[PDB]
Ligand binder design. Structure first.
Ligand SMILES: [Mn+2]
Ligand SMILES: [Mn+2]
Ligand SMILES: [Zn+2]
Ligand SMILES: [Zn+2]
Ligand SMILES: [Zn+2]
Ligand SMILES: [Zn+2]
Lengths: 217, 117, 65, 114, 84, 1419
């Protein structure tokens, strides 16, 4: 979030931070440099002298501390600060200082891509396995269902084949080979499954779509 | 870098590569696919010595933020930051961004030209 | 590029103090620490402004068009 | 692009009032008021004035989200004391305190040389 | 394959998935203006009405629980204890 | 769909039966016969010919006419054609299989060449995997080339037994594209039988041989008597797909049109016809053969475009081609392209940012993203105005809509529409509004390894870009805000809405199945803040109380009466936090030194929603087990808990904002002196290390048994330097003040462990690569800045300095080395874990808990007879204390013995109302005796199970709490006697147990199962509602008690796993997710091990035995040794100093002095002159407890007489085995010398190389009852031989364990295998402290074990692991997968998520695992 200068917590000096980071980012990274640069960067700003933060110099948190202290700030970087909303002091003191920040690319506006379509960012196998775990089958249905028309076929109740000749007006259903007229079902499947099955039949392969779970077993 | 956890140096070494600075001074004169130029590139208040030979104080990539390590409104948790909006207004971290696009005319087509019109 | 007009943090008009600082430096052979305090920039928030600044423009005005 | 125009912070867009007055249900003689396009500037002020007033049992304010310019104000006043009147009263109480300061200042400002 | 109203071994309690799906199915009805069974003591939102119908044991649906062998128990949403 | 009617029932495909079209059926179902290889223009009269594109098949020309099935191009499901093949033809797909079957059956009688008579064949036949059997049979039968006439029976090889009386030799069949070529021989090179005869096995031969294969023979192959006969693999009769499969692009009128399959078929028909017009006309043989192989080619190419070429001559002289395989290359790959989640619709992705002001279950959607994603909302009197308001607002004003969709399915595009502001919304239209505040959306963060990382939130449209998450919903998603994008997905239908908000809704996810705990806690600021706010020293001035108060929206407006009213009205920090907490919430926990006065403000007590004492931090308010979130969730509902996060956050955050929390370098500095102690602590280890150096350079360090000097010197140094870093690290953690911001985070729980403080403040500590100090990369020195052979800490990579102090360049580079090791295999752990988790899922994907509480896979196999052995849902289990198990028998009696007939051990007439008249009531004391003998069995039973003595076991229903609620809900006073009867308790509880029902079957087996599933919960229950307990401790009245019973029963039922639970996926992602956190004594642990285990790798990296000594001798350090030696494989090599071959020709006098005495000594109460003389080493000689005699008579019993052996005796200063052969001698000896040094086993079990003893502290019950640690020696071995080691005298063969769960299986059976496999998988998950509720691993370990063997997870199949032919279409060849499914009659259960997606159906998973129907009952 960006606060305006009003709300920021301010220092006695009327200085206020351009940037508030969180202390919980600190112990677990072991990112002490950030602190010592910050300590230094402060002295530096105060003193005009460019702050040598080179590795393997004889420079020291203790030395940089002494210099800041000479500049009339508390030497460990902290600064009493006043909550901007109320003006009241902050009960705790806030490690305050310049620190070189880089602004990195790949900015928000470049990654807001919101491809909602009526007529990362995916739903891959892993998110599928997630929705399964959830129990959420109809969501899984809605989300994986292709735009492919829910085309309606008819089937024989013996050989789950799509060999049912349907005179729908006349209410007449004949499955040749099986001698079926009464034991016949109608099921909706994506037309691209209908096709795939016919393509499968075309290649001498019976994909039998049944309607009961347990077999003749 | 000798005060950092070892891997943290590695990470930085990467992100520095995605810092916005002033890649070249002649940038206004190059047409390069992406360009990110910082309004107010400042030298780091904390320079390195090796920094000299790197021309960093010359073409710096970043600015000196007045940074507070604070739990503030609660809005800077888990690696967010509360940025000072006013600072932003006065120019802090603004950047030019030059996307330059390129397009040509026809390959071999027997009077199958492409016309910029 | 050129001097920010105002110190980011607080908004001291800082961009009226750049040549004078360059003077406080060259013609009056002063050091930046002393010089910046003379321009009035007393809080490090405004100091880092001038002292950190890189005047790349004087390199941009070196190309022809 | 998503960024709401900055004026929306101190300027009322349409249909919004300055004050919405709601009768707190949870307690007797209490009210919740929503200031639109104000913030702590006013909130913390009015509250700590509202709080001085002794026939006020409860004063609190909160801005529920940093994004929006508005805040809610709850005042619980004694039986037979109207919170609107407590507001009015704590409002006046401020206007008068600032008059003083405005004066005192312009006064002590003139005595200064520079 | 069907199992008689007596000898139902399945939970007398509605399963979180069943509720999820009644409420779903029921709301999908309420949403297309199919008629509601309870008093809409304010509600405009389908699911919230569907839940009110379940609450007041007024959903007119039967859940068919299939056992892994293929046989099944029928329960009436009315019968099913909603305690989740 | 197709607004017409059909009387036919509307159903859903429940099963797909795959098979092969018998030629019979291919005709039977077909409508045409198809003769003419052309279409249209019948002498120019346009339409169609009775040959193609019409004879009965689907119509074109907009014509409804279509065998009277009418309808037209959109409503007709194209009917199938027929085409007789002049000759039998190999169906391309099965050429492979055909050949293969032909290798298994005799090529003359059609008789399986190997019967039930051959023994290697009954093992082949018994295999149930139709595919694996066929392979096992084939690898057995392809050796055969003679269809045996008489086979050695099950008796004498003298005695032959008859079989298929056809003696003919088989060809070895090789392939040549489409022709199978067979070559015979009357044996390999025997006289008068040489030279094979290559003849092409024609289709006509094979088809007839296939027909002769018996229903029995081919069924013992993959083949199905009914669905897929071998013969059917051979095409006689070809299905003709109609015009919807093969279209005709007739550009309006008067232009040609017929697809690239139509032409490809037209050429088959041509070849077919010209093959007929060569039999009907008569012809030469290599003319019909040529005409056959042309046909066979065209049938082949018709289906598979990957043979001896590509026939691309179909209406184009430029030559492109399309087959039906290459049609599925755009239809197995356009279904798979949509099976991989590409066309991501109604979803949106952006940076996430945290936001402490959203509720826990909100997701801040930027307005602009809100304006993009729609929800189709049906216009409804309830919503007509709002919808109308939106439609007016339009695509650009927020609470607006993009599209108004009218009855007719038209889409008014409110953006570009001349009527944008002029639409009368009618009921039943869809408006596609924007998502608005409170829409359930499904918010997910990839990689999403975790039901908890796809949760549903209420939308809250907000200003700027970026999704906004409540901070506490953070780790369920493993999300931070340093750039993470998240996907938001808008459920589109109303039931799809309902499902989200009813199952995946974030509140419903607080207590997660994965570790039977909450998985969302209070975090970062809110945690840190809450601790601070909670300290006793934290007090709140009225002025700020009112805000904090007002901040909690659920506040009731009562200002709490301040805990200090004296000089200043002053509230406790606790008091106001206690208003975030709702009423009825209690919590007792005790830390190390908590009392009811808890000095250190330790522990935790909350009563009726006022935290009475304890600092609130991670323990309480975090995600931890017992914590306040667990409690509030179970006790008060998920939603009311979810709202709690809000309150707590809001209050605490508000508090923190005006208090402030930071951290500086000052926080990371040690007390001047501490630094000297630290510097001393380190410099105190560099002596230790230095002393061990000097020690070892002297050669005074004794190598620890089975460990080299150099190996054990490092080991010491590393531990010194760690003991150092650590005692160093403690030295700074104790220092740092309770002000210390770093420590202030550490106390509270938010980011920050000891190692962190430790490395920043005290020593950084020893770096290490491949678990060793830094290695000599340069020759004998780690950098060119040290001298050669420098083994000091500084050299070998101890970083002495804190990070605060800065690191030396060496330290910096060594740290960099260790660092690079970290990132390198942080990349390995990410990459391997990434894929394990995807295998673990695929493995368990289909396991579900069905309505019978059974847990089954897609096939229907019982994996668990009750889910996780107790039928409980893991999200309804809490760790609970089984008290019956613990403490002295003495104590057991004190708590639980109620003996009325004893003025001493009776219930005192104060506890009980009828307390006095109870004294001496025989009849009662017979009930209370029943109770207690039962409690006694219980304690005994429990100690049999938890041999460990572990009291605390995840069980459902927190009984402690319910009681604690009773005692508060009834204001029970621990002062007046309770109005309970003993009969009330004793019978009440007895009666309660009969009510805890996981299972409901009325039969005995189930009632027995039910009794077991409830056993453990019941002992808890019995031990909790024991008569004394109920009165002594609890003081329950009849009212509260009767309440506790009905509550325990209530929650118990609430705790039972719901049929529907994709419990497997759950179990896989419960094992996976945490492994996606394993980022790291010498045994392979973590992901290498996990990838080792799941892989069921027989070749383990670190095979170990762990043997325990027989009970009576555990302490005997000398018997541990005596076993160690008698186990550790001890070769001659290991005990011989040197070997020498002398020429020493006289077997009496000898050219070796030190042996004159030994030949003399072997002449008191043939041979070569070449002598093999071994000089043995006492050191290792007596160390391995070995005799010269023993070494000797070993070699003498290894080389029969073929070696003359003689050895010095055990007194002689030099130990010597002298050996001669008994002339090519010097060479047979160097062989024998080697056969000795390598092969001969002096002592031990082979493969057991190191055998280390170790003291293991063991929990064992003492005589008085309580659990006492009893140290035991335990041999741990490099090398596994569990069979031979098990049997060694003096070990506890009962307990001997190996990590090689594979050898365990092989020696102890599968059930023990599983037991061990579970202990391994769990060790992996325990080694990173992590917990995963038992049932998850059980289910993994059960699935690995269901089929009698250890079946690996990390894919075993190239196809499947448990996947239907339809499901996620794997390989660029699904055709191949389907072909086999045809041939093997793959029976698809359609319990898949993909099969059913393919079918346009929801899965029978969870919410789709039952059907809904319309009740005719409801009045
Ligand atoms: Mn993180
Ligand atoms: Mn991240
Ligand atoms: Zn049929
Ligand atoms: Zn400034
Ligand atoms: Zn038709
Ligand atoms: Zn034969």
């Amino acid at each position: 979030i960006t606060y305006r200068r009003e709300d920021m917590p301010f220092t006695a000096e009327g200085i206020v931070p351009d940037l508030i980071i969180n202390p919980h980012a600190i112990p677990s990274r072991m990112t002490v440099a950030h602190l010592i640069e910050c300590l230094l960067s402060k002295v530096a700003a105060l003193s005009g002298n460019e702050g040598d933060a080179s590795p393997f110099t004889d420079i020291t948190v203790e030395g940089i501390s002494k210099l800041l202290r000479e500049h009339g700030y508390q030497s460990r970087g902290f600064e009493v600060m006043y909550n901007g909303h109320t003006g009241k002091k902050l009960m705790a003191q806030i490690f305050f200082g310049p620190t070189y920040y880089q602004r990195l690319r790949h900015m928000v506006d470049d990654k807001i891509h919101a491809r909602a379509r009526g007529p990362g960012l995916r739903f891959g196998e892993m998110e599928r396995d997630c929705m399964i775990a959830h129990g959420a089958a109809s969501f899984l249905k809605e989300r994986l269902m292709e735009a492919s028309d829910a085309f309606r076929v008819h089937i024989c109740g013996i050989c789950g084949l799509m060999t049912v000749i349907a005179k729908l007006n006349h209410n007449q259903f004949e499955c040749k080979g099986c001698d079926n007229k009464i034991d016949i079902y109608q099921i909706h499947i994506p037309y691209a499954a209908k096709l795939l099955f016919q393509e499968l039949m075309a290649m001498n392969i019976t994909p039998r779509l049944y309607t009961d779970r347990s077999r003749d077993f | 870098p000798d005060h950092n956890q070892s891997p943290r140096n590695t990470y930085q070494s990467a992100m520095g590569k995605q810092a916005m600075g002033v890649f070249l001074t002649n940038y206004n004169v190059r047409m390069d696919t992406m360009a990110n130029i910082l309004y107010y590139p400042q030298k780091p208040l904390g320079t390195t010595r090796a920094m000299e030979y790197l021309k960093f104080r010359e073409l710096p990539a970043g600015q000196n933020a007045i940074v507070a390590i604070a739990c503030y409104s609660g809005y800077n948790q888990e690696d967010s930051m509360i940025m000072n909006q006013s600072s932003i207004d006065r120019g802090l971290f603004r950047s030019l961004f030059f996307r330059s696009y390129m397009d040509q005319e026809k390959k071999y087509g027997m009077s199958i030209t492409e016309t910029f019109e | 590029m050129i001097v920010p007009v105002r110190c980011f943090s607080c908004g001291k008009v800082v961009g009226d103090k750049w040549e004078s600082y360059l003077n406080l430096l060259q013609e009056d052979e002063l050091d930046e620490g002393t010089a910046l305090s003379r321009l009035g920039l007393k809080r490090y928030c405004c100091r880092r402004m001038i002292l950190t600044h890189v005047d790349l423009i004087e390199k941009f005005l070196r190309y022809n068009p | 692009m998503n960024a709401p125009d900055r004026f929306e912070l101190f300027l009322l867009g349409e249909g919004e009032s300055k004050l919405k007055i709601d009768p707190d249900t949870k307690a007797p003689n209490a009210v919740v008021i929503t200031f639109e396009k104000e913030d702590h500037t006013l909130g913390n002020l009015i509250r700590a004035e509202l709080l001085n007033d002794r026939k006020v049992l409860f004063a609190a304010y909160k801005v529920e989200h940093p994004f929006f310019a508005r805040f809610k104000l709850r005042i619980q006043t004694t039986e037979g004391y109207d919170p609107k009147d407590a507001l009015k009263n704590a409002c006046n109480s401020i206007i008068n305190k600032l008059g003083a300061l405005k004066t005192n200042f312009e006064t002590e400002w003139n005595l200064q040389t520079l | 394959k069907a199992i008689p109203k007596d000898q139902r071994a399945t939970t007398p309690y509605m399963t979180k998935y069943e509720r999820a799906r009644i409420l779903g199915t029921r709301a999908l009805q309420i949403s297309m203006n199919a008629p509601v069974f309870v008093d809409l003591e304010g509600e405009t939102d389908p699911l919230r009405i569907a839940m009110k119908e379940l609450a007041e044991k007024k959903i007119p649906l039967v859940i068919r629980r299939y056992l892994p062998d293929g046989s099944f128990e029928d329960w009436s949403v009315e019968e099913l204890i909603v305690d989740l | 769909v197709g607004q017409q009617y059909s009387s036919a029932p509307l159903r859903t495909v429940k099963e797909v039966q795959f098979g092969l079209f018998s030629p019979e059926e291919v005709r039977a179902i077909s409508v045409a016969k198809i003769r003419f290889p052309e279409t249209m223009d019948e002498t120019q009269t346009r339409a169609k010919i009775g040959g193609l594109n019409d004879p009965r098949l689907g119509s074109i020309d907009r014509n409804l006419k279509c065998q009277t099935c009418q309808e037209g191009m959109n409503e007709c499901p194209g009917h199938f054609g027929h085409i007789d093949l002049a000759k039998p033809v190999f169906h391309v797909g099965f050429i492979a299989k055909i050949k293969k079957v032909c290798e298994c059956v005799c090529m003359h009688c059609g008789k399986l060449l190997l019967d039930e008579h051959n023994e290697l064949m009954r093992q082949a036949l018994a295999i149930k995997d139709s595919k694996k059997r066929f392979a096992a049979i084939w690898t057995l039968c392809k050796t055969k080339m003679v269809c045996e006439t008489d086979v050695p029976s099950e008796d004498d090889p003298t005695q032959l037994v008859s079989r298929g009386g056809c003696g003919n030799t088989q060809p070895t069949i090789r392939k040549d594209g489409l022709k199978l070529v067979g070559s015979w021989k009357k044996d390999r090179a025997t006289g008068d039988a040489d030279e094979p005869e290559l003849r092409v096995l024609s289709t006509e031969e094979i088809l007839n041989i296939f027909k002769h294969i018996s229903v029995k023979d081919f069924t013992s192959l993959g083949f199905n008597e009914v669905f897929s006969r071998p013969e059917w693999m051979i095409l006689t009769c070809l299905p003709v797909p109609p015009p919807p499969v093969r279209p005709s692009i007739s550009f309006n009128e008067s232009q040609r049109g017929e697809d690239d399959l139509t032409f490809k078929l037209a050429d088959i028909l041509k070849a077919n016809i010209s093959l007929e017009t060569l039999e009907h006309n008569g012809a030469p043989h290599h003319a019909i053969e040529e005409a056959e192989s042309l046909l066979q080619f065209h049938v082949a190419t018709y289906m598979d475009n990957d043979i001896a070429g590509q026939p691309q001559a179909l209406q184009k002289s430029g030559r492109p081609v399309k087959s039906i395989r290459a049609r599925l290359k755009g239809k197995e790959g356009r279904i798979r392209g949509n099976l991989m989640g590409k066309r991501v619709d109604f979803s949106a992705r952006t940076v996430i940012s945290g936001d402490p002001n959203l509720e826990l279950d909100q997701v801040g959607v930027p307005k602009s993203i809100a304006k993009t994603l729609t929800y189709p909302e049906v216009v409804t009197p309830y919503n007509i105005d709002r919808l109308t308001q939106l439609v007016r607002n339009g695509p650009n004003e927020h609470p607006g809509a993009k599209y108004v969709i009218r009855d007719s399915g038209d889409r008014i595009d409110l953006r570009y529409s001349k009527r944008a502001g002029d639409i009368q919304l009618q009921y039943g239209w869809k408006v596609e509004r924007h998502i608005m505040d409170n829409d359930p959306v499904l918010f997910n963060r990839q990689p999403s390894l975790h039901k908890m990382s796809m949760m549903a939130h209420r939308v809250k449209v907000i200003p700027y870009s970026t999704f906004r998450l409540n901070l506490s919903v953070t780790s369920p998603y493993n999300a931070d805000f340093d750039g993470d994008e998240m996907n938001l997905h808008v459920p589109q239908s109303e039931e799809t809405r309902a499902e989200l908000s009813q199952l995946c809704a974030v509140p419903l996810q607080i207590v997660s199945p994965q570790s039977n705990k909450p998985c969302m806690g209070i975090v970062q600021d809110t945690l840190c803040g809450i601790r601070k706010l909670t300290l006793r020293d934290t007090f709140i001035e009225l002025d700020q109380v009112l805000n904090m108060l007002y901040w909690v929206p659920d506040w009731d407006g009562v200002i709490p009466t301040p805990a200090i009213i004296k000089p200043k009205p002053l509230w406790s920090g606790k008091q106001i936090l206690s208003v975030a907490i709702p009423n009825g919430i209690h919590l007792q926990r005790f830390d190390e030194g908590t009392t009811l006065l808890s000095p250190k403000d330790n522990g935790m007590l909350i009563i009726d929603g006022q935290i009475i004492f304890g600092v609130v931090e991670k323990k309480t308010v975090g995600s931890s087990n017992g914590g306040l979130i667990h409690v509030v969730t179970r006790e008060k509902g998920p939603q009311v808990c979810a709202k709690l996060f809000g309150n707590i956050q809001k209050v605490v955050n508000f508090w923190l904002l005006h208090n402030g929390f930071s951290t500086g370098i000052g926080d990371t500095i040690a007390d001047g002196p501490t630094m000297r102690e630290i510097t001393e602590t380190i410099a105190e280890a560099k002596k230790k290390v230095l002393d061990v150096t000097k020690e070892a350079q002297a050669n005074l360090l004794t190598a620890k048994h089975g460990m080299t000097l150099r190996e054990s010197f490092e080991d010491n140094v590393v531990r010194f330097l760690n003991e150092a870093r650590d005692k160093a690290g403690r030295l700074a953690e104790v220092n740092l003040k309770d002000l210390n911001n770093v420590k202030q985070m550490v106390m509270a729980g938010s980011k920050g462990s000891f190692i962190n403080i430790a490395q920043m403040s005290a020593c950084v500590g020893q770096q290490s690569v491949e678990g060793k100090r830094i290695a000599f990369g340069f020759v004998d020195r780690t950098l060119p800045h040290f001298s050669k052979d420098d083994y000091s800490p500084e050299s070998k990579g101890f970083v002495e300095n804190s990070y605060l102090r800065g690191l030396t360049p060496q330290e910096f580079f060594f740290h960099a080395m260790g660092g690079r090791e970290g990132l390198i295999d942080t990349a390995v752990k990410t990459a391997e874990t990434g894929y394990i988790q995807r295998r673990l899922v695929k493995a368990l994907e289909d396991i579900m808990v069905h309505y019978d509480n059974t847990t089954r896979n897609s096939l229907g196999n019982v994996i668990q007879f009750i889910y996780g052995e107790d039928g409980m849902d893991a999200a309804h289990i809490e760790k609970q204390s089984l008290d019956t198990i613990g403490g002295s028998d003495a104590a057991f009696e004190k708590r639980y013995r109620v003996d009325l007939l004893n003025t001493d051990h009776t219930l005192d007439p104060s506890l009980l109302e009828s307390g006095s008249e109870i004294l001496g009531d025989l009849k009662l004391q017979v009930l209370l005796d029943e109770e207690y003998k039962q409690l006694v069995k219980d304690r005994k039973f429990l100690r049999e199970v938890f041999v460990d003595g572990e009291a605390n076991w995840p069980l459902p229903v927190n009984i402690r709490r319910i009681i604690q609620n009773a005692q508060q809900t009834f204001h029970i006073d621990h002062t007046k006697p309770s109005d309970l009867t003993i009969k009330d308790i004793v019978l009440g509880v007895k009666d309660l147990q009969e009510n805890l029902l996981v299972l409901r079957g009325k039969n005995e087996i189930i009632q027995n199962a039910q009794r077991d599933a409830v056993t453990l919960f019941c002992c808890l229950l019995r031990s909790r509602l024991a008569t004394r307990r109920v009165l002594q401790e609890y003081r329950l009245t009849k009212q509260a008690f009767d309440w506790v019973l009905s509550n325990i029963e209530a929650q118990f039922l609430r705790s039972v796993v719901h049929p529907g639970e994709m419990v497997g996926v759950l179990a896989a992602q419960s094992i996976g997710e945490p492994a996606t956190q394993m980022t790291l004594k010498k045994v392979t642990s973590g992901v290498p091990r996990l990838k080792e285990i799941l892989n069921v790798a027989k070749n383990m990296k670190t095979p170990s035995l762990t043997v325990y000594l027989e009970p009576g001798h555990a302490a005997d350090q000398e018997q541990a040794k005596l076993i160690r030696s008698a186990i550790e494989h001890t070769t001659l090599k290991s005990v011989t100093i040197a070997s020498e071959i002398y020429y020493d020709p006289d077997p009496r006098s000898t050219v070796i002095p030190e042996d004159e005495e030994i030949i003399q000594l072997h002449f008191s109460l043939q041979q070569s002159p070449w002598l093999l003389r071994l000089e043995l080493d006492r050191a290792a000689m007596n160390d391995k407890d070995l005799t010269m005699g023993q070494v000797g008579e070993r070699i003498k019993q290894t080389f029969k007489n073929d070696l003359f052996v003689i050895w010095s005796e055990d007194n002689d200063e030099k130990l010597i085995i002298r050996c001669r052969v008994v002339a090519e001698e010097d060479h047979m000896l160097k062989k024998i010398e080697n056969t000795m040094l390598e092969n001969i086993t002096l002592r031990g079990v082979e493969n057991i190389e190191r055998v280390v003893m170790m003291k293991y502290d063991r929990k064992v019950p003492s005589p008085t009852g309580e659990y006492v640690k009893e140290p035991e020696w335990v041999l741990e071995t490099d090398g596994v031989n569990l069979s031979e080691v098990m049997t060694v005298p003096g070990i506890d063969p009962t307990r001997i364990y190996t990590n090689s769960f594979i050898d365990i299986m092989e020696v102890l059976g599968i059930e023990a295998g599983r037991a061990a496999l579970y202990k391994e998988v769990y060790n992996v998950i325990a080694s990173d402290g992590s917990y995963v509720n038992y049932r998850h691993m059980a289910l993994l370990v059960d699935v690995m074990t269901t089929q009698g063997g250890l079946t690996s997870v990390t894919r075993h199949g190239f196809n499947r692991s448990n996947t239907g032919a339809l499901m996620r279409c794997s390989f660029e060849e699904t055709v191949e997968i389907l072909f086999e499914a045809g041939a093997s009659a793959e029976l698809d259960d359609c319990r898949g998520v993909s099969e059913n997606v393919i079918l346009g159906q929801m899965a029978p998973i969870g919410t789709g695992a039952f059907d809904v129907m319309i009740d005719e009952e409801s009045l």
